[PDB]
Write a protein that binds this DNA or RNA. Structure first.
Ligand SMILES: [Mg+2]
Ligand SMILES: [Mg+2]
Ligand SMILES: [Mg+2]
Ligand SMILES: [Mg+2]
Ligand SMILES: [Mg+2]
Ligand SMILES: [Mg+2]
Ligand SMILES: [Mg+2]
Ligand SMILES: [Mg+2]
Ligand SMILES: [Mg+2]
Ligand SMILES: [Mg+2]
Ligand SMILES: [Mg+2]
Ligand SMILES: [Mg+2]
Ligand SMILES: [Mg+2]
Ligand SMILES: [Mg+2]
Ligand SMILES: [Mg+2]
Ligand SMILES: [Mg+2]
Ligand SMILES: [Mg+2]
Ligand SMILES: [Mg+2]
Ligand SMILES: [Mg+2]
Ligand SMILES: [Mg+2]
Ligand SMILES: [Mg+2]
Ligand SMILES: [Zn+2]
Ligand SMILES: [Zn+2]
Lengths: 55, 58, 100, 118, 83
RNA sequence: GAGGCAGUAACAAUAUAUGUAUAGAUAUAGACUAGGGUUUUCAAUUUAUUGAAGUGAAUCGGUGUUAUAUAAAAACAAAAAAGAUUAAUAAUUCUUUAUUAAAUUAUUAUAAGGUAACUUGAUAAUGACAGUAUAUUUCAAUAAAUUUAAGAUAAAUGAAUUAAAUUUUUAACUAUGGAUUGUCAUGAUAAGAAAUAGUUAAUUAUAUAUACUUGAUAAAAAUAAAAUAAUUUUAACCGUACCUAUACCGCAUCAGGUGUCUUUGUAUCAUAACAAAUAUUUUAAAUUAAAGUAAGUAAGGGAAUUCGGCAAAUUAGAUCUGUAACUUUGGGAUAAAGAUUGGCUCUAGCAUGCUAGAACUUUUACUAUGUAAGGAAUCUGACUGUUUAUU
RNA sequence: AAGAUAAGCAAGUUUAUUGGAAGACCAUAAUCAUUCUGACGUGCAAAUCGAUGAUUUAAGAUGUGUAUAGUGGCGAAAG
């Protein structure tokens, strides 16, 4: 059960990756989204609704 | 108009101290170290004496 | 009677440094300033690495590469005297192997 | 009556137990060579730890008495015996001082962890 | 120079007893002293943390005791390895 | 539902013959958050009632990361400032000059130069981390000079008082060199000093460099590339009025309580006190009671009063002499006990605003405010510390 | 108090500076509650007001976030 110091940084991030996914199984929490000026996927979709009214 | 306090009283009194009048023995209320620091007087002396030794060497 | 104008929160934390500037019309304002940054240091000898631009890492990515680096191998990490010990050491350890 | 102090202290250790490092050394088949990198200090314990480097991997170990940064040590079942080296138990003559003894083979260490005790 | 026989333990004043201040004078003399560097040969080794001694010039850390640079139980086990 | 006591206890009560003014009086004032929710502004009718109007964001907060299996409007993080407008909003509206990010356009270097430290389009860096003391006087502020303006005095005055602006070398590293040299303090050097030639920088006081205390050594994670010019019905969702105590909590327009910051002038250690600035405010009598709540003074005696000097009084700042028994050798000690102190005109030192001495003069000098009564013994606890919110 | 420098006398030892350690000493703002057994006592107030006192770089004071629940919790200890 002996590990190097350098391998222990990998096991922390792998532990902190599972904790990000188990949050979405808890009832009654607000959803985590991306920051708006970096999330380019939402800016494309809302603009598609925008010019649809123009027609 | 607004008011502003006059300093004509204090400008006169500061002139008599410039001749050394009002600094008696009966008008001191602090210690000798409070009115003049003893540490700064050593720094004034040792900085001037170190300057004049460089000029006499050059 | 003049009054200094303050805008924002009034706590004195690390990022809330302010100074007092005088306007042409006569106002007084407490303007905010940028966060204080320090010099980068060598990874081994721990001396101050000058000629590299010291700023916050957000603005540091906007600079040119000549202002981030020095024209030398390992120019971003080491001082330039530590590389002289490395090159002599790396060459001499090869000649010890060929004998033994 | 009420619950006394002794039982109330142990259940306060189950709500927030104390944390330490438990430093162990690896196992290698043959004799290798490693270098001492740096010396640090932890919160709870008084004895300083040491970071050694075997095969480009950095582990943590308890520092022996005369140790300086950059020194070289050997680890193996048949290493020569000197200050700071780690060998098997049968090689050392009678009368010396050892400070990390595993109970069984291929374990980290069990006996002699604190500073000043040998 | 001002003190007759107290020495470095004059900071404690007139409390904690008499023989408790004798035990402080033995330890505080060897902690604040500077020593020679075994690597570079200069007298610049000082202590900063319990069990860590470092030099000012060459900047190389040495392991050691709590309050002394060398331990009396540490030097006897160096002699038996020389033979 | 309504009596007696009873119109009794207890509280509130500035001046002017003409006034949107002339005076008096009390209270430091102004911004962010927690709490309140239209109290904001205007009109009409008398701290009320009704009716209209009012909150404008790519760069000000939230929405993002985490504190070793639900945590931050003060920790971390792409980017702005003046100058004016409204009855009420303004880093949000308008004018002027800027900055960030993403999508489409036009153009192109794939390396030169210096012995070296390094200079220019030519990537792989960090977020990121105790406390105390001393030395720098950056800014800023004072002080001086000058130029425009203001207000008062029966008179007099080398030209007073107030406002606005314009000005007042060091540390690393490299090349020669071969043995000395610095700081307020501790020092630095054959692992190359002084002296020369040169290349980088100088972190703006919440800074820089040193030193000191420790069985205390002083958090995490998301997060990165670069040359020049141009374009845009490109940059989403929520809050932006008002109050800081007569617009909060104590059943109230309650002498109580409540996180942070800023604030002018005289003030020879400071403190205390006064004045600026700003906000509020209208009308009974009086040389006369007793007994109360506060503040003063006292001939002669000086603790005889009392369970007990309970209450009050005396001492006190600063300079110079002088200092005991005892002791855990550090203390006791600022022990105790004496002497001096103003105003004006000069002389003498150098560090140039601090300190000694001398002459003349008076109903004699820290004392408006602030400021230790002292000594000799006994019992008990070692000391700094903590405790029955309300005997 | 350590540390450091000079001038004397002759292995040392007196005198004068520099330096700034300590759960050392004293005040303002802030905090607490010894005495008058003062004021008030159908009160300003279901614990307040005035004078006098004690306190100072720490075993301190304080906003927010997470953890501890009634035969249970927290406690430099008074039920
Ligand atoms: Mg009345
Ligand atoms: Mg209304
Ligand atoms: Mg307004
Ligand atoms: Mg504006
Ligand atoms: Mg607004
Ligand atoms: Mg507003
Ligand atoms: Mg408040
Ligand atoms: Mg009130
Ligand atoms: Mg009367
Ligand atoms: Mg009398
Ligand atoms: Mg009399
Ligand atoms: Mg009597
Ligand atoms: Mg009697
Ligand atoms: Mg009394
Ligand atoms: Mg005289
Ligand atoms: Mg006691
Ligand atoms: Mg009580
Ligand atoms: Mg103290
Ligand atoms: Mg009473
Ligand atoms: Mg429950
Ligand atoms: Mg009892
Ligand atoms: Zn280096
Ligand atoms: Zn060394």
């Amino acid at each position: 059960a002996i590990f190097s110091l350098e391998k222990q940084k990998v096991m922390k991030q792998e532990r902190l990756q599972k904790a990000k996914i188990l949050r979405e199984k808890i009832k009654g929490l607000k959803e985590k989204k991306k920051q708006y000026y970096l999330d380019l996927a939402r800016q494309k979709a809302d603009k598609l609704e925008a010019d649809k009214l123009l027609n | 108009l607004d008011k502003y306090n006059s300093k004509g009283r204090s400008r006169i009194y500061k002139e008599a101290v410039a001749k050394g009048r009002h600094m008696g023995l009966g008008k001191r209320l602090g210690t000798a170290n409070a009115r003049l620091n003893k540490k700064t007087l050593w720094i004034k002396k040792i900085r001037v004496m170190r300057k004049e030794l460089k000029d006499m060497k050059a | 009677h003049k009054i200094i104008i303050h805008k924002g929160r009034t706590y004195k934390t690390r990022s809330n440094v302010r100074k007092v500037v005088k306007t042409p019309s006569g106002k007084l304002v407490a303007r905010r300033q940028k966060k204080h940054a320090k010099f980068h240091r060598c990874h081994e000898c721990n001396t101050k690495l000058l000629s590299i631009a010291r700023m916050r890492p957000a603005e540091f990515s906007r600079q040119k590469v000549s202002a981030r680096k020095v024209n030398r191998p390992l120019g971003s990490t080491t001082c330039g005297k530590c590389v002289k010990e490395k090159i002599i050491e790396a060459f001499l350890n090869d000649e010890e192997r060929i004998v033994r | 009556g009420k619950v006394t102090r002794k039982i109330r202290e142990e259940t306060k250790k189950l709500r927030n137990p104390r944390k330490l490092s438990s430093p162990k050394y690896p196992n290698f088949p043959e004799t290798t060579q490693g270098t001492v990198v740096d010396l640090v200090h932890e919160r709870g314990r008084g004895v300083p730890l040491a970071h050694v480097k075997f095969n480009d991997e950095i582990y943590s170990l308890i520092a022996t008495e005369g140790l300086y940064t950059g020194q070289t040590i050997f680890i193996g079942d048949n290493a020569p015996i000197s200050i700071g080296n780690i060998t098997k138990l049968k090689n050392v003559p009678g009368g010396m001082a050892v400070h990390s003894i595993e109970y069984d083979y291929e374990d980290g260490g069990c006996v002699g962890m604190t500073g000043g005790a040998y | 120079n001002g003190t007759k026989k107290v020495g470095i333990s004059g900071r404690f004043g007139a409390r904690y007893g008499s023989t408790l201040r004798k035990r402080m004078k033995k330890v505080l003399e060897t902690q604040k002293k500077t020593y020679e560097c075994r690597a570079c040969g200069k007298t610049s080794v000082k202590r900063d943390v319990v069990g860590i001694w470092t030099c000012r010039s060459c900047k190389i850390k040495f392991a050691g005791g709590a309050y002394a640079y060398v331990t009396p139980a540490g030097t006897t086990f160096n002699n038996m390895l020389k033979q």
